[model samples]
Structure formats: C-alpha cells, structure tokens
Target: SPLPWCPHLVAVCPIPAAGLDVTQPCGDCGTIQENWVCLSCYQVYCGRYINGHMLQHHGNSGHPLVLSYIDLSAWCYYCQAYVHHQALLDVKNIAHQNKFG
Candidate 1:
C-alpha cells in the first residue's frame, strides 16, 4: 500500500506535545480535550488512543496513525508497520520549519 501523508512527518507541525495544554478542548471536535490524537486524521481524542477517539473514529477512517511522540515504537495506522520516530520526526521538523503554509 502507498504510504499516507503525515504532516508531522513531512510538513510544518506547530502542535507539538510539549506545548499542548491537556485542559483545553479539541481543535477538531470541540468536545474532548487535546490529549490523545490520531496521527492519521489529525484529530485529538480524549484519554487513551486505543479505546478513545482514535479507535472510534480514526480506526475505520485513518488507521495506522501514531500517537505523537508518546508511542514512537507503535505501528503506523496507515502504514501498518513500525515507524522510525527519529526519521519521521525529522520530516515533521522540516515541514513545520520549511514547508509552505
């Protein structure tokens, strides 16, 4: 299968986990907090990645997305394989720093 596009992996990503405020509402849904986010759909899910929004919405829509820097060893939902965090993160840095907005 063709690899899906990940802005965090290839574009400018301003939403780093370090700067995120968990107490705030989701940017996409506006119902949940910005805790766990689906790497595929770029939607933030509350609580866990497996049982929360990622599984509920992104599972069928954008499976294989990573959980930001939290689960670096996890298999990509879109790729269905283990992704090298460093490599992907490098691209994310590039996109965030150099990509056209």
Candidate 2:
C-alpha cells in the first residue's frame, strides 16, 4: 500500500519518470556502481559507497526522493526513510530495462 504522505498518491510528483542508463557514470562523481536516480531532475549520482553524491544532490537541490538502481528502492529525504509507491515500482521496471537491456 502507498503511504499517506507518498507524493504519487497525494499529487503528481514534479519529477517525471525517465530511463536510467546503468552503464552511465554518476553525474556527481564517476562511479557506475551503487548509483541512484534523482527523480527531481533525472540526474544520476553515486551512493554512499563512492561519495554519497546522491545525498549531496538531495541536500543541494532540496529534492525529497531518489530511486536506487542497485536495489530498486526509493528514499524520501523529507521522511528520512525509504518509501514504497506504484511510481517507485515503475522506476524499478525502468531500472530493470537499463540493467538487462
């Protein structure tokens, strides 16, 4: 079930869904592994392993949500936790496409 505060259930998220190329390097650093997609701007950034660029992007941009390509998960900055939603599932599909295609 979607959370009551989930952006998708309440209103349209400003960030639109886009394909994330798994082969592409992180927008902040250059690491290809453990990268995440910033739905707010569709920018890919490294995860905690490389330099936590994704979190840095969130702090700088004030965007609340990011989708992880590594685990097909979603994190909300405002909530300070991982969240689930139909849109996140869709992001997983896109990630799968990029990973396998």
Candidate 3:
C-alpha cells in the first residue's frame, strides 16, 4: 500500500467503493474495476466517469451510484476519494489510520 506519488498520503483510497470488496471483474475488459465501482444500476465507472457514467451509462442521480464504501468494522461509509494524512483531518476532527502493527 506504499504510494510513491503521494508518499505522505494514506496509501489507500478511503472510498471503500474503490477497495477490493466492491471491485469485480469487468464483463468486457476482464480487468477488475479496482479503480472503479459498479453502480447500483449495474454499470462501472470512475470519478472521471461521473459525467458519462451518470449520463449515457447511468442516467439516474437520485441513487447517485457514486463511490460508496461501508466500513462494517468502523460503522461508517467512506465516500468519494481518499486524501493524504492531514487531508483527512481537515474533514474529520478525529484522524484514523488503518495501519497494522
């Protein structure tokens, strides 16, 4: 989980939707949508895909099949992106790290 690009950031995308749990093999590409998630509408797309992913592919916003991850253990749903260490603090007063001992 070491990211050289943003070494200071949490080497993980907090958007649980982008995590291994939600990612599945693409019926077409054969590549696991690791960076994307399958919307409830049954279409997969990335943040960039918000426009097209929501438009032509999935034209429903009420459900907002946007990235969503429910942290069962923590009892929280991580949405959208995973920012750096301090970046997380900006949004949340309590900082959490999934680091292993």
Candidate 4:
C-alpha cells in the first residue's frame, strides 16, 4: 500500500514469468546469497560488497532497475533508491510467497 513512484519501473519483470527461482547463485561467480536480479535482463548477480558484480552489471547494462533477493524490493540504479508501484505488484507478491510460503 506504500507504493513509491519510479520512472524506471518496467512493464515486465522476469521474476514471476521465471516462476520465482531467484534462489540461484550469481551469474558471475556463483555466490548463492546476497544476490540481486536485474529487471532488464533478469540475470542474478552478487552484491556490491560481496563482489560488485551486480554493480558492474549496471555499469555494463545500464539496466536501471534491480530487485533485491534479500528484501524483494525494487531499487532504481539510475535513481539510486528503492521504488514500488502497481507494475511491481506481481514480482513483489511472488517474491513474498517464495520467501514466506
């Protein structure tokens, strides 16, 4: 209910379509935890602190929006902030179910 505005929210996020399998490891080094999923490509990568691969991903791809596997939240790399809206509903809900159910 506390949706935030984001100019970067994509019409499609691959998470729900991928059937919520973000439990996978990083695409760069296979670090299983502290990873994120790119909204543009839906590829999983490790955290910046872990290896900076995801941040490097944004640098190479400029994908803008990324979803945290840890919190199921959308973060705009371009804006450098968390974001939420109706377009994000399905991914968020699916993440919630995957984590809690």
Candidate number achieving the greatest TM-score relative to the actual structure: 4
Of 1 and 4, which scores higher on TM-score?
A: 4
- Candidate order (lDDT): 4, 2, 1, 3
Best lDDT among the predictions, by candidate number = 4
| TM-score against truth, every candidate | 0.38, 0.77, 0.25, 0.85
Q: Quick one: RMSD of model 3?
A: 11.7
Against the unseen true structure, what C-alpha lDDT does each candidate score? Answer: 0.44, 0.72, 0.30, 0.79
Report how far off residue 42 is in candidate 1 (Å).
1.4
| Candidate 3 wrong stretches, greater than 4 Å | 1-21, 45-56, 59-64, 68-101
For model 1 the TM-score comes to: 0.38
Clashes of 1: 9
Each model's number of backbone clashes?
9, 0, 0, 0
The local distance difference test score of model 4 is 0.79
How would you encode candidate 2's per-residue C-alpha lDDT over 30-81 as one tens digit per residue? 8888888876677888988789999898889887787787776777777777
Give lDDT tens digits, candidate 3, residues 67-90: 222221110113222323443332
lDDT of 3 at 61: 32
1 or 3, greater by TM-score:
1
Give the alpha carbon lDDT tens digit for every residue of 11-60 in model 4. Answer: 34555455766687899999988888887778889887799889999999
